[PDB]
Design a protein around this nucleic acid. Structure first.
Ligand SMILES: [Mg+2]
Ligand SMILES: [Mg+2]
Ligand SMILES: [Mg+2]
Ligand SMILES: [Mg+2]
Ligand SMILES: [Mg+2]
Ligand SMILES: [Mg+2]
Ligand SMILES: [Mg+2]
Ligand SMILES: [Mg+2]
Ligand SMILES: [Mg+2]
Ligand SMILES: [Mg+2]
Ligand SMILES: [Mg+2]
Ligand SMILES: [Mg+2]
Ligand SMILES: [Mg+2]
Lengths: 292, 159, 204, 169
RNA sequence: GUCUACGGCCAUACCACCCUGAACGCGCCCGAUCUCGUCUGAUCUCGGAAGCUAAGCAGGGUCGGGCCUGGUUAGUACUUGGAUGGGAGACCGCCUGGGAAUACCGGGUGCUGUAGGCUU
RNA sequence: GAAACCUCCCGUGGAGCAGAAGGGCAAAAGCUCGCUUGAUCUUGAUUUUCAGUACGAAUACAGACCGUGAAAGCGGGGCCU
RNA sequence: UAUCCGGUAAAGCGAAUGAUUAGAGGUCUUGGGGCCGAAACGAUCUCAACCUAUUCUCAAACUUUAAAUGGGUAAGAAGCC
RNA sequence: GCCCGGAUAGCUCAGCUGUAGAGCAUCAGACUUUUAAUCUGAGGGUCCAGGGUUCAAGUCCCUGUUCGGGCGCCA
RNA sequence: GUCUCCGUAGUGUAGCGGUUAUCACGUUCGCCUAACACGCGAAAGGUCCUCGGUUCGAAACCGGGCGGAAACACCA
């Protein structure tokens, strides 16, 4: 035995952490720096390009932050990319680009800066950013919101950033974290990035596996092999998707209805029920001990 | 004689209250102060940059400047026998909108509503406030049961 | 050796206890606050009488000791060596200063003389518990103790069972009901907030 | 008929605490490197102890976590040396266990009058699929209750997997 | 009905153990070619989608601790202003208005914004 | 071996933050690494002592030039007194 | 009449810090002294500190609570639209 | 502030840009019955610290840190 | 009361934050002597006054304890 640590005392004096800190989601240190505005700007927005990758998804949203709760103007998920051409490998870097680009075009059609601010159509991969036009409405500027990602080089986040940037959002960055950038040399290949953007780093993996061992390649790339998507059908495919995304981004939802409204969940037990149960439990205890 | 140090005797003044330590909840920042907005200053331990001086805690004033993350904020300060209006730059964290004014405005808006209406009607309505009056004549019905007697009760030493 | 108790009677100052700050405090006279059969269960001694003050004054540690002694001694000689339990109920905590004179009044803040209690009007000083036989001894025990204190105290023989916080008319009844439960010189009060496993220890 | 409460080995931690520094230490590191097939890491002292003769920040020991297959096999060896006997006390309440081998040649290495004989000390850290939520960065948490590995539960695992005895006393 | 992403207020939301989780999600999960990082692909980074709700997560359970909010405590303690009131003092009673906090006993145990799912 | 090093678990902070104490601080204001000189150049305003003079101390801005970071930002000495 | 501020009296210490009485319960820890033991967490006491619920009494330099009295604003034309 | 001076092995002191001297002290051999005394060897120098001049510095050069003797003294 | 300093094997004392705590005497054990002394060789022995702190580290530096010792206590 030992001194019990978590006594009444403990809990009495104990302060919870913020809810999303408790969840393990929001980094409040950054949130503050990121999100709140200068006061002499007053009410005017400060947008984000939220980018979050989830086990099988890539979510990219744009939000400023009102006191009630930060608001999403515009968002595109990975699992929308089927419409456009990407059928699998949707959590991967290339898809991130697609998502991030998508998000850009979608947002630039809403304000009607679709025809202005094309951005970068060729997909070089180089340092690019949007010079706002004069005699025209300016470019949309959001700052990247990386979450709890260790933001090394190669972090998919910077893919979706790239995508958006090439899509036509004025997001500040450096290239020091796109794939390519050589840590122990300090320049940038750009073509290396392009390859990652297009899936070649995936394609190459596929080829290396089929060479080495069929059973491993089949296990690794099942849904890739299914759908008939090869290493040599890949770069084209993404370029087609970017072309689809670029040409028609707007979202339509699904008209959800015909809901039965049954309670899957289990409702909370009313006082009297709870007050009953102990009555029963005490009575039950009494009748049991009145035998032996 | 005492020390004239800046923070002297703010042990319980700038002290985040019980189970409210830690992170400054964002709303605080993301809410907006213009010129002419009335504000009650109130120091806060955590944010030290731009902490207002102890004399101006609780004291309440108007906002005459707005820098990136601060506000210049005219307050009054009685110095012996000559109140000084004076102007102090305070970081947002140690500052709240005063509600003192809101309730006046609410009442102005209500008057201007009740002025627009009841003009076409002809009846002039009592807009002014009026003090809590003498409490009117009225009956007390003691239905059936007569009022209960109350005997004063004997002393006995408890402890 | 020590000043007369006239001079440190009244509650003139803020309390000044043996802390970080007030140190070098010579020890109190009174150390042993309870004596008799303090190993007695609640059932075998129900009848507190509580010498209870009526000033707002300070009683010396040295006084308490004498009183306690004077009460114990009379309780033994009367009822028996182990026929009761006493509980002194004012620990001296206030330290009481003394600027000694071989300069003048120059920088005269005292050294600590000793310790002392602070008693409110109606605070208990000493309370004894013993048997319903015994009450007349109990009072005289307390009577005699009173002389060892300044001010005024009123001996009162008082409703609770034992030393407990429970009214003696109800105490006999409660125990069978098991709202109260024996626990040395005191009694634990088991109430229906419980987790029911606790309830199932009783009734079984 | 459980799904994935498949009590496995998370890591086998090895260390050699010479408590000298200099040669014997770098000479010991060669033993772990040979054994494990991975450069080990030195651990410096917490604070100075005259009684032991170790200064603060003096490199005292050398150690090495091994995971996966190579950890399994090295666990196998060590148990062969201890002829598949462990004790109840060698199993911690948290579900893990360890033991020491008194000399490393008994494993499967050749002595050298230079690289003498380092005694070392295995510690097995048992896990379960979904024990990473502890130590990931984003949506951290505990690992439930009925998921934690009991002292009992490990002992029977060891008893089962390696045919071990677990002598009393 | 309920989830995810970003949130506001920051325990009515925390802690402990127990049950239950349709579909979508979120997860654990399986890999190390590349990107990236480790003594270690455990973490981090990346490529996946054979398993599985065991865990996280969600909903509930508990005469549960905690927290929340009422009652009681008590018109008690205190206290503004008043008297050529009392009392040797210590202190107290009154007038005039203001009025707490435990133990104790009840009830409650997240609400909610924006965007996008599932139950078609 | 009570103390060496290794491992798992608990831990509202009971540690640490140069120094007195008090405040404040946990994906930090603590520890560890990486790069750096905002401890630089310069107008005024304001606070604190105040007589509402100075000194010192500090708080907001503004213009230079730089550091750092993917960035939002942060920094013109030391978490604050 | 609206609306902030405050940590004093009080209260609290079965809430943090410190201070402190007593019995119940605990081989937690281990001991130092015993008695019955070769010795044995064996039996039996014991006193050390630690722990589980309890209990006695405290704080100018403690505090969850927390008044009275008290200090700020505001109650329109320099305002509304 | 100015001039000057010493710092070298345990200690006290030599040293003229190319194994750092003397004596004592320290340790092993003689002598002694043994010790001391004494004679022999042996070991021991960051030449106070840093930078330079120089092919090369313990020294020449500057810069410091000390250390002492004398001078000197306007916020 | 003030201000000061000192508390280290049996004794008297050294000790410059990292020591096996130095020196002398004393003690013990050999020899030398017939014996002893002197002498020679060996050995043992510090609670570094006490407690707390700082420090990676305190016998010392810093604080308070118990001891011990000088100088002052004047003008009426
Ligand atoms: Mg960050
Ligand atoms: Mg007299
Ligand atoms: Mg006084
Ligand atoms: Mg993995
Ligand atoms: Mg689950
Ligand atoms: Mg489940
Ligand atoms: Mg409850
Ligand atoms: Mg009068
Ligand atoms: Mg940080
Ligand atoms: Mg600037
Ligand atoms: Mg700092
Ligand atoms: Mg105060
Ligand atoms: Mg009080």
């Amino acid at each position: 035995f030992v001194k019990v640590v978590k006594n009444k005392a403990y809990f009495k004096r104990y302060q919870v952490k913020f809810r999303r800190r408790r969840e393990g989601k929001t980094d409040y240190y950054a949130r503050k720096r990121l999100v709140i505005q200068d006061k002499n700007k007053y009410n005017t927005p400060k947008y984000r390009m939220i980018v979050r990758v989830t086990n099988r998804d890539i979510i990219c949203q744009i939000a400023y932050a009102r006191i009630e709760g930060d608001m999403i103007v515009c968002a595109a998920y990975a699992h929308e990319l089927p419409k456009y051409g990407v059928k699998v490998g949707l959590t991967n870097y290339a898809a991130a680009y697609c998502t991030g680009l998508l998000l850009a075009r979608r947002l630039l059609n809403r304000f009607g800066m679709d025809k202005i601010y094309e951005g970068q159509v060729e997909v070089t991969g180089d340092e690019y950013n949007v010079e706002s036009i004069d005699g025209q409405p300016g470019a949309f500027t959001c700052y990247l919101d990386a979450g709890l990602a260790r933001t090394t080089t190669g972090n998919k986040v910077f893919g979706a950033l790239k995508g958006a940037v090439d899509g036509g959002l004025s997001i500040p960055h450096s290239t020091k974290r796109f794939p390519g950038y050589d840590s122990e040399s300090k320049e940038f290949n750009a073509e290396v990035h392009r390859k990652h953007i297009m899936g070649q780093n995936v394609a190459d993996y596929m080829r290396y596996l089929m060479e080495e061992d069929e059973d491993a390649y089949k296990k690794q790339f099942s849904q890739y092999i299914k759908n008939n998507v090869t290493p040599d059908m890949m770069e084209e495919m993404y370029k087609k998707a970017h072309a689809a995304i670029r040409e028609n981004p707007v979202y339509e939802k699904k008209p959800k209805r015909e809901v039965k409204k049954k309670r899957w969940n289990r409702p909370k037990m009313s006082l009297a029920q709870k007050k009953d149960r102990v009555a029963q439990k005490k009575a039950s205890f009494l009748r049991a001990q009145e035998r032996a | 004689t005492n020390t004239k140090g800046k923070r002297r005797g703010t042990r319980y003044m700038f002290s985040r209250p019980f189970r409210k330590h830690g992170v400054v909840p964002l709303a605080t920042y993301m809410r907006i102060y213009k010129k002419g907005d009335i504000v009650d200053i109130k120091g806060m331990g955590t944010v030290q940059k731009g902490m207002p001086h102890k004399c101006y805690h609780g004291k309440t004033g108007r906002v005459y400047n707005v820098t990136q993350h601060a506000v210049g904020i005219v307050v009054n300060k009685q110095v012996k026998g000559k109140i000084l209006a004076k102007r102090i730059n305070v970081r947002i964290e140690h500052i709240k909108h005063s509600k003192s004014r809101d309730s006046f405005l609410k009442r102005v808006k209500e008057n201007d509503q009740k002025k627009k209406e009841a003009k076409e009607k002809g009846t002039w309505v009592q807009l002014k406030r009026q003090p809590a009056p003498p409490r009117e004549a009225h009956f007390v019905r003691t239905n059936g049961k007569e009022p209960e007697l109350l005997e004063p009760i004997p002393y006995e030493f408890m402890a | 050796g020590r000043r007369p108790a006239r001079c440190y009677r009244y509650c003139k100052n803020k309390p000044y206890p043996k802390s970080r700050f007030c140190r070098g405090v010579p020890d109190a006279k009174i150390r042993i606050f309870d004596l008799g059969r303090k190993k007695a269960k609640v059932d075998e001694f129900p009848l507190c009488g509580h010498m209870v003050s009526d000033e707002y004054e300070q009683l010396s540690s040295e006084a308490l000791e004498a009183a306690r002694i004077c009460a114990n001694k009379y309780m033994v000689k009367s009822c028996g060596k182990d026929g009761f339990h006493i509980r002194v109920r004012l620990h001296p905590f206030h330290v009481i200063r003394i600027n000694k004179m071989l300069t003048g009044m120059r920088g005269a803040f005292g050294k600590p003389q000793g310790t002392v209690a602070r008693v409110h009007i109606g605070q208990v000083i000493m309370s004894i518990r013993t048997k319903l036989q015994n009450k007349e001894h109990v009072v005289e025990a307390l009577r005699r103790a009173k002389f060892k204190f300044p001010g005024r105290q009123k001996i009162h023989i008082s409703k609770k069972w034992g030393f407990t916080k429970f009214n003696a008319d109800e105490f006999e009844d409660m125990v069978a009901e098991k709202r109260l439960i024996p626990d040395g010189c005191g009694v634990k009060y088991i109430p229906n907030r419980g987790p029911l496993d606790k309830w199932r220890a009783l009734h079984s | 008929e459980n799904p994935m409460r498949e009590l496995r080995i998370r890591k086998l931690c090895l260390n050699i605490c010479v408590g000298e520094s200099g040669d014997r230490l770098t000479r010991a590191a060669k033993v772990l490197e040979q054994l494990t097939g991975q450069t080990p890491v030195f651990s410096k002292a917490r604070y100075t102890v005259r009684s032991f003769g170790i200064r603060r920040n003096e490199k005292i020991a050398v150690h090495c976590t091994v995971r996966g297959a190579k950890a399994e096999e090295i666990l196998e060896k060590g148990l062969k040396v201890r002829e598949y006997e462990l004790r109840k006390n060698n199993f911690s309440d948290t579900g893990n266990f360890g033991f020491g081998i008194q000399e490393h040649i008994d494993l499967g290495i050749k002595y050298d009058p230079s690289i003498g004989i380092y005694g070392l000390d295995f510690y097995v850290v048992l896990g379960r699929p979904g024990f990473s939520i502890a130590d990931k960065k984003r949506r951290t948490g505990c690992i439930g209750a009925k998921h934690r590995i009991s002292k009992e539960e490990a002992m029977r695992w060891f008893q089962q997997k390696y045919d071990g005895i677990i002598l009393p006393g």
